[PDB]
Amino acid sequence: QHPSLLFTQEEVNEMRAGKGTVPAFDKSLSEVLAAADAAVNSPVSVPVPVDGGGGVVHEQHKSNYYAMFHCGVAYQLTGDKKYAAYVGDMLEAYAKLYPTLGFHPLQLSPVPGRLFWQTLNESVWLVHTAVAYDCIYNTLSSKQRATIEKNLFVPMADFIMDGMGDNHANNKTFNKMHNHATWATAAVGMIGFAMNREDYVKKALYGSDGTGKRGGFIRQMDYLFSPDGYFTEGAYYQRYAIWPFVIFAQCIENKLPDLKIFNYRDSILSKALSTLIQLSYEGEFFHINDALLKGLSAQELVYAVDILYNVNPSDKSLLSVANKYQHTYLPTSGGFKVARDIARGEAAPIIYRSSVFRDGRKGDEGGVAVIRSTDSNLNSALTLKATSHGLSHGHFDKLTMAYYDNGNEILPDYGASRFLNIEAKYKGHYTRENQSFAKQTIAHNTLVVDETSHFAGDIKVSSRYHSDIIYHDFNGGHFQVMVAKDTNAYPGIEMKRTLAYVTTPFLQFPLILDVLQANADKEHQYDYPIWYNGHFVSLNFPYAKATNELKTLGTKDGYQHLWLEAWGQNKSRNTSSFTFVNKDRFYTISIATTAQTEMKMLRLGANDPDFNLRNETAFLIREKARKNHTFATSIETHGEYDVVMETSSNLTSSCEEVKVVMDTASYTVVKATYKGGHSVMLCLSNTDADKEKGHRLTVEGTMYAWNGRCGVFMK
Ligand code: NI
């Protein structure tokens, strides 16, 4: 009967008999045992709660649940009674303390805990401590178990479910479709499994009323993901959210195998993990919405990989995720199996595929589209984000694009402004500049109208709406294309964005064409920003540069944070080109312009009194007093630049012209001309998205015929 949460007795016996046969697993287990030994060698401290996040007491109780977790696992994997004694002594200290605790003295959280300032931390503590208890259960006397369950576990589970006294806010969280409810239901269900309390299990799975209609872990699996396994807050918070799902699902599979939890909703948990992998580049998640440095190496993804690979070991690509990015394994049958199958040479390459991940519970509220390189000599990704808002972490970023190549982020998404766990920098919280800059439209690679963010930067307005991915073709032979549309970011303005990834026979690397159409009945200022990662090489037009004084580009909606470093116009050519270098590769952005277009080089860092912003750079194209406008862009990747060997070639752009050669209600046509008499013609049906519809168009005496929304012609 015990253990059964993280593993069964048979599985523990197997792991112990297998010691020495898989060195990588042995190394991970040794690290668990070292953590447990460190806890055992230290005095036990269970202080009266007095502080919030980062406080010494808060951090002590957090350390305690990790210590109990590690000691319970260590006891199971070694049989050494000192680990079980540690857990038992600490549980008896908690059972003495907990009956004396009212609501936490700190008046800050809308759902205050008793052990912690917020109930979320109480739930995380209980998940880990339920595992510890399960691991040491048989070493305790009946008297000890009765006291611990009566004075600690039953009151804590009841509190997480229902609150206390007159404050029942915890019950609203318990039944919510939210990550904090995933933790609360995992905590209550896992301690219910450990105590054989079927009522806790039922309410964790199906909500307080048991119907599954207005709460519960199962319903969360139906509501917190799209049908493609996409979590609407983004990839960084999807990483956080997947962790309690896979932990609790593994417990459910051990105790209730006939529920087939890992098949539920077409194996939604597997889809979540797959989506996380397909939304990463070089192991790092695309920094959409609020996001910090985080990727496939995170412990949440070690849990997800080891648990889900154990459920379907035919998915050998997961072994590569573990071997390339994780190098560590759970102390479970699944972690052992991952390390063992890696050692047997079974890992298969990770296959990154162009994809559309739909947003919304039903998949009908926008999406994220990713075009992936298909040539095995290359390593590139191009993203187009056309989602719902994204709840509290959402950015005002409809139709934003990003480009990744050659191991690097080339045209980036900024992510969040936040200095995790650095108390001296805004106590580690999201900074003022996360709201005033990082969420604003100008921080992104997308259209900004009249120096105003999408939805005027109002979360409640933005939360009404979503963009649409309206067309895609990832199998065009010589190209891939994706198209998105938004009509609510700026009421009265229709925005469309087409991104084509074209493999020409005449350029060194695949070409990207971007076409951003804005259609309005009133005049506006249209800003087209391209944030770039690298060092300035050249502009093909004259510019002025700040000499001894720098001023800001604007005053509001993020523009107050932008230094205006250089500015210029192109009076002599119809195409304006910016070349920069990133590591050993050059990139050229070429855009169709007129003599009235304004070009600006920007650098982040103004109005930043606390040094909360990075020194990032952008190339901005500004059009004044336009009703309809088409931004047409060629993005070239070119050149070999070896500083160690001191060699170089193809360092200059080959783009001679970008021109909109037709722009009617029915069709928009862009011609990009390259050295040697070569060209790419991109033909766009503006008014339908039918994959099978045929089109014919005449440009410059030549007839262009194609099927589907977008035609790509090369010569
Ligand atoms: Ni962003």
UniProtKB/TrEMBL annotation:
Its main location: periplasm. GO terms for cellular component: periplasmic space. GO terms for molecular function: lyase activity. Gene3D superfamilies: 2.70.98.70, Chondroitin AC/alginate lyase. Residues 70-280 form the Alginate lyase domain. InterPro entries: Alginate_lyase_dom, Chondroitin_lyas, Hepar_II_III_C. The keyword DNA damage does not apply. It is found in: Periplasm. This is Alginate lyase family protein. Residues 359-621 form the Heparinase II/III-like C-terminal domain. Keywords: Lyase, Periplasm, Signal.
